Amino acid sequence: VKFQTLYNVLTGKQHLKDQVPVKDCNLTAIFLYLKRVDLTRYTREELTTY
Amino acid sequence: PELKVLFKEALLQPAKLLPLDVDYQCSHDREVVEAKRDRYLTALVEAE
Amino acid sequence: RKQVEELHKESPLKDYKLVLETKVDPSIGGGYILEVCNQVVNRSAAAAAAETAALAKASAAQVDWTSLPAAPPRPSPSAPDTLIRLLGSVVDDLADADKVEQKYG
Amino acid sequence: AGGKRYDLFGYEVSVATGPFIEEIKKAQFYDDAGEVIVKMNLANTPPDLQTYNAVLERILNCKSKRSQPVKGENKFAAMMDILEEMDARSGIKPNAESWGYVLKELVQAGDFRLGWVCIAGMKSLGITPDQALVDANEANAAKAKAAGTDFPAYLKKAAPESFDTKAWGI
Amino acid sequence: HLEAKQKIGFVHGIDGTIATIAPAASKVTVPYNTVLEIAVSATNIANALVFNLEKDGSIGVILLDNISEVRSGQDVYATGSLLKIPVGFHMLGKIINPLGKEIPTGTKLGLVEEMAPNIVSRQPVNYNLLTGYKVIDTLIPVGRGQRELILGDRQTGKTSIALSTILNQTKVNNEILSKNNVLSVYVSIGQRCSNVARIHRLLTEYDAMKYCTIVAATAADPAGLQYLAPYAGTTLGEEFRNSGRHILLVYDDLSKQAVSYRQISLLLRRPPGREAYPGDVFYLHSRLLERSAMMSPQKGSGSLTSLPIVETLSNDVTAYIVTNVISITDGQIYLDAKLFTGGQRPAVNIGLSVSRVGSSAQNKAMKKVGGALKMLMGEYRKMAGEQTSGSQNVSPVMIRGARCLQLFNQKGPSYFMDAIVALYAVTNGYMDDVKLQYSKFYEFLLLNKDLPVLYGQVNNKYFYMYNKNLNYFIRYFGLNHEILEPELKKYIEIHTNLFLDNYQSRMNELKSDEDLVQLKNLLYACKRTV
Ligand SMILES: Nc1ncnc2c1ncn2[C@@H]1O[C@H](COP(=O)(O)OP(=O)(O)OP(=O)(O)O)[C@@H](O)[C@H]1O
Ligand SMILES: [Mg+2]
């Protein structure tokens, strides 16, 4: 059930409250797309700026 | 001259001045804390 | 049987004899139901499934995995005086800006 | 305790307060002291000045109102609402020890203007403040005056000469 | 494992919320006012209370929940106990049903119907309750245990007073110890679910939900549940009352509870009475309101305040339920549709309002200001009507009265320090040279800003407004004390002078239409933020 909900969050079919973004740190603390999560760990500003 | 020494010390250890542990508990995501840190550094450079 | 006459013993009257009747219910296909001394006990698959589902379902609803950010408590700021000495005007602006930025990002 | 205390109705109340004071002194979060008083009034052992002073000592010496922190907790508002309870509600009048704990809290917190208020209240009530506290109060005042921290910054900011709901911070 | 269910019979007839239960077996007994569980389905269970037991074994029943699901052939079982609800600290922060069910959003069982304390268990009140509004805290004081009525027309400001009173407690409760806190319960009867959700979101916004709980009996919800809700809120409060804690309780509103009881009675063909009501509605509200009391030190010195709400019709206090509640309550807060439409908000009519007990609980610092403003308003009510546009007058009475009525125009709860000083200035004439429309700005600029600190007039030693912990010295010593009085006078004098010189003159100097609109916007903002 919860695993299915996690899979739905990664799929984007189900979203979090108050429009919270999906991140590995965010996901870890709650509990091709996966490569995008590991990317999500790294700071966005650092990636774009550098 | 004391004040100049304090600016040099503050630039050398900007993070030491802040309470890192409190802010780190508080922020769910590290990125938020990082943005706060960047703004403080820029403000000190503008001050001097 | 054991449950039957034990329930008959728990009853206020036990001097009287005990008779047992058996019936069939289409709606429920598992378990039995027993009635003695105007006391009913339900031990059926529909009823049992509903009870077990209530425990699991209620736990699942309490967890509320979907849409569950975690926010820690905030202590007093206790900002150092030396910081404030260097830039008193702006540091105030930055402290107000921080909270807004935390909510937006 | 040969003296016998009575309620407004004339019923007898018990002065035996020692075990509750022992519970207060053993506490490490200063809301449990209030919980002690709540369990104490139910036993018809209405608080005495010694108990309120133990509560004040507990508020001062304790680290937090509770195990977990609280938004807006102040040791001073507790150590003054309890005195309002002492004087107004219960009729008991505080002593120099009570105000002394209050002034210790104000000195630790760095608030110096309210420390002068506490000093003047002590003096108007015939109480002699401890000079070790008022000297530290004046020292904190000198510190705040030297660095311009005598007041916050948002007060000394120049006001908007033009009237605007956004400029006035509303 | 061993748990069993006791069957008392089957349903025979249903009529709306009411029902009749036929016994299954002779020589079976059901106790009176006991809840009964109807076999709705294999898992779903209803709940229903007895009101009469007949010679024939037939039982009258009031269905509290799941009336749409009840049918005739269904089983009926007996719990064998009174109607009880879970109560405690854990129930706080949770909107719930009267029975105890939690209504979701985006061990200790207390009795619903319990006798009120006797005269020896009670006590005259000594501590106040701060509604956050100046009219109430000044002239219509509210003690803890003092149940004071709110009367008003539809859309007049009745619910907002109770919500602001609940919200005002958060700022204090976080500071002081938990014993002197004011927890709160809010019973909504007959109200729309959207309004309850808005109330929940607001209380969660201001972080007042941790101290507050809500009982919901909407207009769509059945009638027995609406009749039962305030008794359940009183049950949630009685635990904190008898446990030495204090608590507040709100009823929005008892005028709709009576309609639900009228449904229940007339569906049972009970002999009606005045204005269609059975005649026992007085007892219905008295059972509820007498439970609100200030308990004796023998009983913990706790408290249970009650701010009920009642809907008049065309400003008529001579209705039946209104007088029935005034005959029970220890006061009255009369809000008027005329003043509400006339911009005065809260629309309290001081003449038709009174607090029979709050003078004992009022703080001395507030007591003196309230005596002064009471004299002032008793003069103002006469000086305003005696002229009837015969010839205007420029006297300090009418001036100060108009200034103070503008101060009473208040959108949300105010702090005690913020409440006194603004009225001290008017009673003592410091706010006489300013204009009417520039009173709110004055107050805002006095409290949220500090002109003396801004312009360097730092001659005062401690009296300022940026701290707000000075309130607890004002609450103990009083402003008329030798120490706070001169510094207060100097602060207010400097504020008046700097206002009249640097702000008011610039206001009068403005003549551009866009500037006047900008200023009116600022004044409407000051009318809210204060
Ligand atoms: N002091 C005030 N200032 C500005 N607006 C107010 C004030 N008091 C109430 N209102 C407004 O009046 C409207 C209704 O207020 P409230 O909810 O208290 O009415 P009510 O008496 O509950 O109405 P009803 O009896 O129909 O439920 C709301 O829009 C509210 O914002
Ligand atoms: Mg309303």
Side-chain angles (χ1 to χ4, degrees):
Chain A
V1 175
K2 153 185 84 178
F3 284 104
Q4 180 60 27
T5 294
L6 157 62
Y7 173 88
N8 287 341
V9 166
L10 298 169
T11 304
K13 290 169 173 174
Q14 296 175 213
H15 315 265
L16 301 181
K17 263 162 211 195
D18 195 2
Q19 71 168 2
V20 171
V22 178
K23 311 184 171 175
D24 197 337
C25 64
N26 200 314
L27 195 66
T28 296
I30 289 176
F31 310 116
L32 286 176
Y33 277 113
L34 292 161
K35 305 200 158 169
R36 302 174 192 186
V37 166
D38 204 333
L39 179 64
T40 312
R41 282 177 63 201
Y42 293 104
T43 301
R44 167 178 65 72
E45 169 68 42
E46 291 180 336
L47 289 167
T48 301
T49 307
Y50 291 73
Chain B
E2 180 187 2
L3 176 55
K4 185 171 184 177
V5 177
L6 290 169
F7 285 117
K8 173 182 174 183
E9 177 183 1
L11 293 172
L12 196 55
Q13 313 297 354
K16 173 188 300 184
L17 188 158
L18 277 64
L20 186 150
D21 181 12
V22 179
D23 297 355
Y24 267 37
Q25 189 169 16
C26 298
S27 173
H28 190 109
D29 184 356
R30 61 186 268 278
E31 185 269 331
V32 169
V33 180
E34 170 181 0
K36 166 181 195 169
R37 197 169 296 178
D38 186 4
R39 292 197 306 278
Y40 281 117
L41 288 168
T42 51
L44 293 172
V45 174
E46 291 181 3
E48 62 176 29
Chain C
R1 288 300 170 276
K2 289 186 285 296
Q3 291 95 42
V4 177
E5 68 265 0
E6 284 173 0
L7 185 59
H8 184 65
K9 266 83 174 175
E10 293 174 356
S11 47
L13 57 89
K14 56 187 68 56
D15 305 355
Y16 305 84
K17 296 174 60 176
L18 186 55
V19 175
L20 202 65
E21 302 182 0
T22 60
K23 308 175 182 176
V24 176
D25 182 356
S27 292
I28 298 183
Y32 64 96
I33 292 177
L34 173 63
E35 183 174 350
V36 176
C37 300
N38 303 133
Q39 294 194 10
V40 61
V41 60
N42 201 357
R43 292 182 170 283
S44 70
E51 182 179 356
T52 60
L55 297 171
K57 174 191 70 175
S59 61
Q62 183 183 222
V63 174
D64 190 5
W65 276 122
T66 60
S67 294
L68 182 62
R74 280 292 297 159
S76 299
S78 298
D81 301 359
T82 58
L83 197 157
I84 300 173
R85 184 183 179 178
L86 299 174
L87 203 60
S89 298
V90 176
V91 159
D92 297 325
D93 183 6
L94 277 177
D96 188 1
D98 289 4
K99 290 291 180 299
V100 173
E101 287 172 10
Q102 290 185 353
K103 294 297 177 63
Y104 272 92
Chain D
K4 287 178 87 76
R5 184 177 177 175
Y6 294 112
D7 280 323
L8 76 170
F9 287 106
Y11 297 113
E12 195 183 1
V13 301
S14 48
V15 179
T17 303
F20 306 104
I21 292 156
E22 291 176 359
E23 279 172 356
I24 285 154
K25 289 177 176 168
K26 289 175 186 184
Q28 54 180 6
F29 301 116
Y30 59 83
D31 203 352
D32 301 343
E35 189 169 2
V36 164
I37 291 157
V38 166
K39 300 293 292 303
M40 201 171 61
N41 278 315
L42 294 160
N44 213 9
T45 46
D48 205 72
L49 172 53
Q50 300 289 102
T51 299
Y52 285 115
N53 286 325
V55 172
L56 292 166
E57 182 170 7
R58 194 65 267 165
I59 292 154
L60 182 68
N61 297 122
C62 278
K63 301 288 179 66
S64 65
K65 190 173 168 186
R66 207 168 289 167
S67 63
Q68 299 293 118
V70 179
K71 303 302 302 307
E73 66 187 356
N74 281 328
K75 287 177 179 179
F76 170 65
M79 294 166 81
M80 205 69 198
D81 186 76
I82 198 169
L83 312 180
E84 190 189 355
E85 169 164 359
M86 198 192 297
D87 198 357
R89 278 197 198 73
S90 70
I92 295 153
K93 284 181 86 74
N95 53 2
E97 178 169 3
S98 189
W99 298 101
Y101 283 121
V102 174
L103 190 64
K104 284 174 193 176
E105 203 284 334
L106 289 171
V107 162
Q108 290 182 8
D111 193 358
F112 52 97
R113 302 191 179 286
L114 282 293
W116 290 323
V117 178
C118 180
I119 289 282
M122 283 202 205
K123 286 191 187 298
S124 61
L125 297 164
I127 292 160
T128 300
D130 192 1
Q131 291 289 324
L133 302 171
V134 74
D135 291 328
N137 189 357
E138 292 290 332
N140 289 323
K143 279 177 79 70
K145 181 66 75 65
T149 317
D150 57 350
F151 294 93
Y154 61 88
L155 302 177
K156 296 184 280 288
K157 285 174 186 173
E161 55 263 26
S162 71
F163 297 104
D164 198 354
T165 299
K166 186 163 185 172
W168 281 101
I170 295 157
Chain E
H1 170 269
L2 189 140
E3 302 177 358
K5 280 193 174 184
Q6 295 179 353
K7 196 176 190 165
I8 69 179
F10 294 89
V11 186
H12 172 93
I14 296 157
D15 191 6
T17 68
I18 55 160
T20 293
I21 310 308
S26 166
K27 65 168 175 186
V28 75
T29 55
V30 286
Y32 194 75
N33 287 326
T34 53
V35 69
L36 310 175
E37 286 179 352
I38 294 151
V40 173
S41 75
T43 187
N44 189 5
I45 292 150
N47 275 307
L49 189 69
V50 181
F51 68 91
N52 70 334
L53 306 167
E54 296 178 2
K55 182 184 163 169
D56 312 331
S58 56
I59 301 149
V61 173
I62 310 175
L63 306 169
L64 310 174
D65 279 332
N66 296 103
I67 297 96
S68 42
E69 298 289 328
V70 185
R71 288 163 58 168
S72 296
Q74 294 187 346
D75 304 318
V76 188
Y77 318 112
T79 55
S81 176
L82 275 301
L83 193 44
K84 290 164 174 178
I85 67 179
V87 61
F89 275 94
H90 66 278
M91 204 57 52
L92 304 187
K94 307 201 299 185
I95 185 161
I96 58 172
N97 215 22
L99 311 191
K101 289 175 182 176
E102 185 170 359
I103 291 161
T105 61
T107 56
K108 191 166 171 58
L109 296 171
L111 281 74
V112 170
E113 276 174 330
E114 195 180 345
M115 284 298 307
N118 58 358
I119 57 168
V120 165
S121 167
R122 307 220 181 195
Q123 178 181 356
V125 69
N126 47 9
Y127 204 64
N128 60 358
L129 182 64
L130 305 174
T131 52
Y133 291 158
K134 297 188 267 285
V135 176
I136 293 160
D137 299 341
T138 310
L139 304 172
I140 309 158
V142 183
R144 295 177 181 189
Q146 174 182 351
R147 61 214 187 285
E148 193 163 43
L149 186 62
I150 294 159
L151 298 180
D153 304 332
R154 54 174 176 274
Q155 295 98 20
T156 303
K158 317 187 281 284
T159 300
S160 301
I161 289 166
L163 293 173
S164 292
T165 296
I166 291 159
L167 292 157
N168 190 13
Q169 306 302 327
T170 303
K171 175 63 176 292
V172 171
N173 294 343
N174 295 316
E175 297 173 350
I176 64 177
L177 301 176
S178 299
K179 66 184 280 290
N180 294 322
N181 284 5
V182 179
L183 308 168
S184 67
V185 178
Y186 177 78
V187 194
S188 56
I189 305 107
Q191 302 303 325
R192 312 183 288 167
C193 193
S194 66
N195 290 9
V196 176
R198 287 193 306 95
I199 290 155
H200 172 275
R201 286 186 177 272
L202 185 65
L203 294 178
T204 296
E205 171 172 11
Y206 289 81
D207 203 9
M209 207 70 200
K210 57 182 157 180
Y211 300 119
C212 190
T213 177
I214 296 172
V215 171
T218 64
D221 279 322
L225 193 146
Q226 283 184 31
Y227 163 55
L228 204 78
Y231 295 98
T234 305
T235 293
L236 296 177
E238 273 196 344
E239 192 265 313
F240 295 102
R241 188 197 69 190
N242 297 316
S243 179
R245 310 274 166 186
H246 308 277
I247 194 168
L248 178 64
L249 180 53
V250 187
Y251 309 113
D252 192 356
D253 44 359
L254 300 171
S255 56
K256 296 188 183 186
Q257 192 198 359
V259 174
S260 81
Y261 202 58
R262 189 179 74 186
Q263 284 177 34
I264 293 159
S265 293
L266 297 167
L267 289 164
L268 299 167
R269 303 187 167 280
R270 294 275 180 71
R274 190 184 294 280
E275 211 177 4
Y277 295 97
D280 55 3
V281 71
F282 167 74
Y283 180 46
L284 178 155
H285 289 140
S286 85
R287 276 190 292 184
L288 172 72
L289 296 166
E290 283 287 311
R291 288 167 84 175
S292 298
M294 187 71 188
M295 298 290 266
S296 191
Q298 188 182 4
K299 301 288 184 189
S301 77
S303 194
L304 162 55
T305 302
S306 296
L307 268 60
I309 294 154
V310 165
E311 190 179 353
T312 57
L313 292 168
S314 193
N315 279 319
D316 180 71
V317 290
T318 61
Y320 187 44
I321 302 299
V322 173
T323 59
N324 281 129
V325 178
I326 297 158
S327 197
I328 302 154
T329 54
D330 303 328
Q332 189 200 340
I333 292 157
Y334 187 81
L335 310 167
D336 197 355
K338 308 293 174 61
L339 311 177
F340 185 84
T341 304
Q344 197 186 347
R345 298 181 181 196
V348 173
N349 200 349
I350 294 146
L352 292 167
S353 299
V354 70
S355 169
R356 306 186 194 181
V357 183
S359 182
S360 172
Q362 212 174 13
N363 273 102
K364 56 189 163 183
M366 212 80 207
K367 201 163 176 182
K368 294 181 78 66
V369 177
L373 285 170
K374 185 174 175 172
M375 295 175 74
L376 180 60
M377 286 283 167
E379 291 182 353
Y380 184 81
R381 285 200 289 286
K382 296 175 185 174
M383 290 189 77
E386 70 190 5
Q387 66 192 2
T388 182
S389 75
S391 70
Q392 301 178 7
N393 47 358
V394 178
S395 51
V397 169
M398 294 292 290
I399 292 159
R400 292 169 182 182
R403 294 304 99 73
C404 202
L405 292 175
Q406 295 290 301
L407 296 174
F408 293 157
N409 302 342
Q410 179 176 357
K411 180 65 171 177
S414 178
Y415 197 60
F416 203 67
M417 194 181 175
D418 298 342
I420 296 160
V421 174
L423 304 169
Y424 184 93
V426 183
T427 50
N428 289 288
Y430 290 103
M431 192 201 290
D432 283 339
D433 306 334
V434 301
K435 288 181 78 66
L436 185 75
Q437 53 257 32
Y438 306 136
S439 298
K440 301 308 305 183
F441 190 59
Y442 173 100
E443 199 184 2
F444 170 74
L445 210 64
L446 177 64
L447 305 166
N448 274 285
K449 308 298 187 77
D450 293 325
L451 308 189
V453 174
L454 172 53
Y455 290 91
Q457 304 208 24
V458 76
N459 55 339
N460 278 13
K461 196 159 178 184
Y462 50 77
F463 185 84
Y464 296 107
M465 281 270 175
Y466 70 95
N467 209 328
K468 310 296 188 183
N469 293 325
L470 182 64
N471 178 28
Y472 294 102
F473 280 121
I474 292 158
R475 212 169 158 74
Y476 191 81
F477 290 118
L479 294 168
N480 287 107
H481 206 265
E482 64 193 358
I483 71 191
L484 307 171
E485 191 71 3
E487 297 276 315
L488 174 71
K489 287 189 178 189
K490 288 175 178 179
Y491 188 87
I492 296 156
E493 191 190 2
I494 297 157
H495 180 73
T496 46
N497 300 345
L498 296 175
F499 180 80
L500 287 154
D501 298 329
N502 298 6
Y503 291 99
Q504 188 163 315
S505 301
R506 308 193 298 100
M507 289 167 171
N508 303 324
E509 274 182 355
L510 291 170
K511 302 172 280 296
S512 189
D513 304 334
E514 61 91 10
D515 284 325
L516 294 164
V517 170
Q518 198 178 4
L519 182 64
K520 283 173 78 70
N521 296 345
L522 179 58
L523 295 175
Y524 292 168
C526 283
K527 193 171 69 169
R528 292 197 302 283
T529 193
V530 175

